[PDB]
Structure formats: C-alpha cells, structure tokens
C-alpha cells in the first residue's frame, strides 16, 4: 500500500462544487492513462450495502456535498492498494477541505506528493454553482449564504493546505468555472506531477 507509495506519486484534487476539477481531474485518468481514484466509487462500495450510510452519503458523493473522513479515507486506501503495485501515481477527485479530514488519510493513504486544488471565484463560481438550486436545490439558494460559507470552508483549508505546502505538493489551480482555461494550469501540473 504505502510501501509502494513512499516511492509513488499520490494526488489529492481538492476544490468546490461548480468549480470544475470533476472535468479536469478525469481526462487525466482518461487522457494520460493515469490512476483514476475517486471518492465517488471510492465510497461508493459502502453504499453498495444499501445501509443507513448508503442513505446519507450515496446522495453526498452525487452533489459533492461534505465526506466523512470515515468512509472516504477508509474506502480511499482500500482502492489504492489496488495498483500501487504498478501505479506510478493516483487521482483522486473530491478530497475534502479540512486537515480533520486530512490527518486520517495520511494513515491509511499514505503521504501528501501531490494535491490539485481546483478554484473558483466568489461571485463568478457563484452562478453557475448556487443557482443550480432551481434545479436542485444549493445550501440556502442565495449568494448571501455562498458569502457565509465561503468562509467556512476557506478557513478549515487554510490549514489543510498549508499542511501539505510543508511538502511543497499543493498545486493551486484558477477553474473559476470552464474547464478550458483552468486547463492551462491543471495540465502544467500534470507534467511536474512527479
């Protein structure tokens, strides 16, 4: 697992919902042949179960809402000994955006080498983001609360992120929403990767 780790390349996407790292983070796995690990299936085998957990987080991994460390962790490192026999590096899509998150998952994961943190802009992300509740339906449907939880988050990433600069593998990117030109930075990133 981490055995093969300390000597592969392990990548963590972090970002926000309507950001856009959903679309990067997969041509790459798709495009360049890389490991593709996402918390969406990565969870998913516990909802598979159909228990009250493949009540509450099955719906959590669809709109990308709040993952428990428990089972996103857990079932991360159970999908990532899967090839780090022949994995020379993984995607994962949907990390989470707290070190409270972050401290498990060095435990059972194994170590930060790379971190893809898809941004977004305030008011920009914004449109496309928040106004998906009339067709859904967001956190309070307004750009008011957008502004209240913006720091919510932001400040539990203040720490995360920092953590994982101490290894220097955090890699910002501007995805202020399409994916074309946050392409630009994702993919500079991509080619470093190592």
């Known amino acids: 697992m981490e055995e093969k ?4 390349k392990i ?6 919902p309507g950001s856009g790292k959903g679309t990067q983070c997969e041509k790459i796995v798709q495009k360049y042949g890389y490991t593709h690990l996402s918390t969406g299936d990565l969870l998913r085998s516990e909802v598979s179960s159909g228990s009250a957990r493949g009540k509450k987080l099955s ?5 990308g809402q709040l993952v428990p460390l428990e089972t996103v962790l857990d079932m991360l490192r159970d999908a990532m000994v899967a090839k780090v026999n022949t994995s020379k590096g993984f995607l994962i899509d949907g990390y989470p955006r707290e070190v409270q998150q972050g401290e498990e998952f060095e435990r059972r994961i194994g170590q930060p080498t790379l971190l893809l943190y898809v941004d977004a802009g305030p008011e920009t992300m914004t449109q496309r983001l928040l106004k998906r509740g009339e067709t859904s339906g ?8 957008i502004k209240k939880r913006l720091e919510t988050y932001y400040k539990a990433t203040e720490p995360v992120i920092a953590f994982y600069e101490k290894r220097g593998i955090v890699r910002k990117v501007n995805a202020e929403g399409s994916v074309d030109s946050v ?3 994702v993919c500079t990133h991509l080619d470093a990767l190592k």
């Open 11 to 16: 990548i963590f996407v972090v970002g926000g």
């Open 138 to 145: 967001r956190v309070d449907d307004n750009e008011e609360t």
């Open 183 to 185: 392409f630009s930075q």
């Open 5 to 8: 780790l300390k000597k592969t």
């Open 59 to 63: 719906e959590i991994m669809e709109k």
